[PDB]
Amino acid sequence: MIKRYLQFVKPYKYRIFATIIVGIIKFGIPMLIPLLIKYAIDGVINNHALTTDEKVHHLTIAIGIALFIFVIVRPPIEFIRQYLAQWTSNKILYDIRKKLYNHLQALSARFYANNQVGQVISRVINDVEQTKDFILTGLMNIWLDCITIIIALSIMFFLDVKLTLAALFIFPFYILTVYVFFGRLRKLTRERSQALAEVQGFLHERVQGISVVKSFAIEDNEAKNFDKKNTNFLTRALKHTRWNAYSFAAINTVTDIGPIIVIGVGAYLAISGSITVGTLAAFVGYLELLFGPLRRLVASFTTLTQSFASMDRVFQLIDEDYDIKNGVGAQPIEIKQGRIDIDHVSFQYNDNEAPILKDINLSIEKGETVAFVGMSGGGKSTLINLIPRFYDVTSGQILIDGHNIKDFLTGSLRNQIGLVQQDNILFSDTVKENILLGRPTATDEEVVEAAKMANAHDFIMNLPQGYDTEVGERGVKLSGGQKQRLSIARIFLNNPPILILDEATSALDLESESIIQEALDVLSKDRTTLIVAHRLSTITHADKIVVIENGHIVETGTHRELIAKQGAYEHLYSIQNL
Ligand X SMILES: Nc1ncnc2c1ncn2[C@@H]1O[C@H](COP(=O)(O)OP(=O)(O)O)[C@@H](O)[C@H]1O
Residues 339, 403: Cα–Cα separation, whole Å: 10
List phi, psi (to 5°) of 558: -85, 145
Least separation in angstroms between residue 115's CB and ligand X is: 12
The span of 113-121, 147-155, 301-309, 519-527 binding Na ion (CB under 5 A) equals 519-527
Beta carbons within 8 Å of 320's beta carbon, 6+ residues apart: 103, 107, 111
In the list a copy of itself, ligand X, Na ion, none, the entry touching 209 (Cβ below 5 to 8 angstroms by class) is: a copy of itself
Pairing state of beta strands 417-420 and 498-502?
Answer: parallel
Residues 64, 62: Cα–Cα separation, whole Å: 5
Residue 399: in which H helix or E strand, if any?
A: strand 395-400
Q: Please say which residue, 373 or 437, places its beta carbon nearer to Na ion.
A: 373
Least separation in angstroms between residue 544's CB and Na ion is: 11
Pairing state of beta strands 552-557 and 395-400?
Answer: unpaired
Contact 294, 149 (CB under 8 A): yes
483 annotated binding-site participant: no
List the one residue from 122, 148, 529, 538 that touches Na ion (CB under 5 A). 529
Footprint of ligand X (CB under 6 A):
113, 349, 356, 376-382, 463, 472, 476-479, 481-482, 532
SS3 of residue 318 by DSSP: helix
Beta carbons within 8 Å of 78's beta carbon, 6+ residues apart: none
Q: Please say which residue, 208 or 363, places its beta carbon nearer to a copy of itself.
A: 208
Least separation in angstroms between residue 420's CB and ligand X is: 13
In the list ligand X, a copy of itself, Na ion, none, the entry touching 269 (Cβ below 5 to 8 angstroms by class) is: none
Q: Please say which residue, 51 or 376, places its beta carbon nearer to ligand X.
A: 376
Residue 96: in which H helix or E strand, if any?
A: helix 74-106
List the one residue from 131, 164, 369, 424 that touches Na ion (CB under 5 A). 369
Least separation in angstroms between residue 531's CB and ligand X is: 12
Q: Please say which residue, 18 or 365, places its beta carbon nearer to a copy of itself.
A: 18
In the list a copy of itself, ligand X, Na ion, none, the entry touching 551 (Cβ below 5 to 8 angstroms by class) is: none
In the list Na ion, ligand X, a copy of itself, none, the entry touching 529 (Cβ below 5 to 8 angstroms by class) is: Na ion
Q: Confirm or reject binding of residue 524 to Na ion (CB under 5 A).
A: yes
Beta carbons within 8 Å of 218's beta carbon, 6+ residues apart: 212
375 annotated binding-site participant: yes
What is the distance of C-alpha 452 from the center of its chain? 39
Q: Please say which residue, 196 or 546, places its beta carbon nearer to Na ion.
A: 546
Least separation in angstroms between residue 523's CB and Na ion is: 9
Residue 51 DSSP label: -
Closest CA to 258 of 351, 165, 147: 165
Contact 547, 569 (CB under 8 A): yes
Q: Please say which residue, 285 or 480, places its beta carbon nearer to ligand X.
A: 480
In the list a copy of itself, ligand X, Na ion, none, the entry touching 524 (Cβ below 5 to 8 angstroms by class) is: Na ion
Pairing state of beta strands 403-404 and 417-420?
Answer: unpaired
Query: What is the residue type of 445?
Result: E
Distances (CA, A) of 407 to 214, 340, 389, 392, 410: 48, 14, 11, 12, 9
Q: Please say which residue, 215 or 441, places its beta carbon nearer to ligand X.
A: 215
381 annotated binding-site participant: yes
472 annotated binding-site participant: no
Residue count of the chain, please give it: 578
Least separation in angstroms between residue 325's CB and ligand X is: 19
The span of 103-111, 123-131, 447-455, 520-528 binding Na ion (CB under 5 A) equals 520-528
Least separation in angstroms between residue 439's CB and Na ion is: 20
Residues 567, 360: Cα–Cα separation, whole Å: 20
Beta carbons within 8 Å of 2's beta carbon, 6+ residues apart: none
Q: Backbone breaks in the chain (C–N > 2.5 Å) follow which residues?
A: none
Contact 176, 247 (CB under 8 A): no
Residue 353 DSSP label: S
Least separation in angstroms between residue 13's CB and a copy of itself is: 20
Q: Please say which residue, 115 or 556, places its beta carbon nearer to a copy of itself.
A: 115
Burial of 185 (0-12, 13-18, 19+ CB in 10 A): buried
In the list ligand X, Na ion, a copy of itself, none, the entry touching 206 (Cβ below 5 to 8 angstroms by class) is: a copy of itself
Q: Confirm or reject binding of residue 538 to Na ion (CB under 5 A).
A: no
Least separation in angstroms between residue 384's CB and Na ion is: 15
Q: Confirm or reject binding of residue 177 to Na ion (CB under 5 A).
A: no
DSSP bridge partners of 369: 529
In the list Na ion, a copy of itself, ligand X, none, the entry touching 369 (Cβ below 5 to 8 angstroms by class) is: Na ion
Q: Please say which residue, 219 or 543, places its beta carbon nearer to Na ion.
A: 543
Q: Please say which residue, 328 or 510, places its beta carbon nearer to a copy of itself.
A: 510
DSSP bridge partners of 546: 372, 556
Least separation in angstroms between residue 342's CB and ligand X is: 15
Contact 204, 229 (CB under 8 A): no
Q: Please say which residue, 247 or 505, places its beta carbon nearer to Na ion.
A: 505
215 annotated binding-site participant: no
In the list Na ion, a copy of itself, ligand X, none, the entry touching 356 (Cβ below 5 to 8 angstroms by class) is: ligand X
Distances (CA, A) of 574 to 152, 542, 562, 568, 569: 94, 18, 11, 10, 8
Pairing state of beta strands 544-549 and 357-364?
Answer: unpaired
Q: Please say which residue, 523 or 532, places its beta carbon nearer to ligand X.
A: 532
Least separation in angstroms between residue 461's CB and ligand X is: 11
The span of 315-323, 346-354, 362-370, 471-479 binding Na ion (CB under 5 A) equals 362-370
- Alpha carbons within 13 angstroms on the beta-carbon side of residue 102 total 5
Residues 443-502, interacting with Na ion (CB under 5 A): none
380 annotated binding-site participant: yes
480 annotated binding-site participant: no
Least separation in angstroms between residue 493's CB and ligand X is: 22
310 annotated binding-site participant: no
Binding-site annotation: residue ranges = 374-381
Binding stretches for Na ion (CB under 5 A): 369, 524, 527, 529
Binding-site annotation: residue ranges for ATP = 374-381
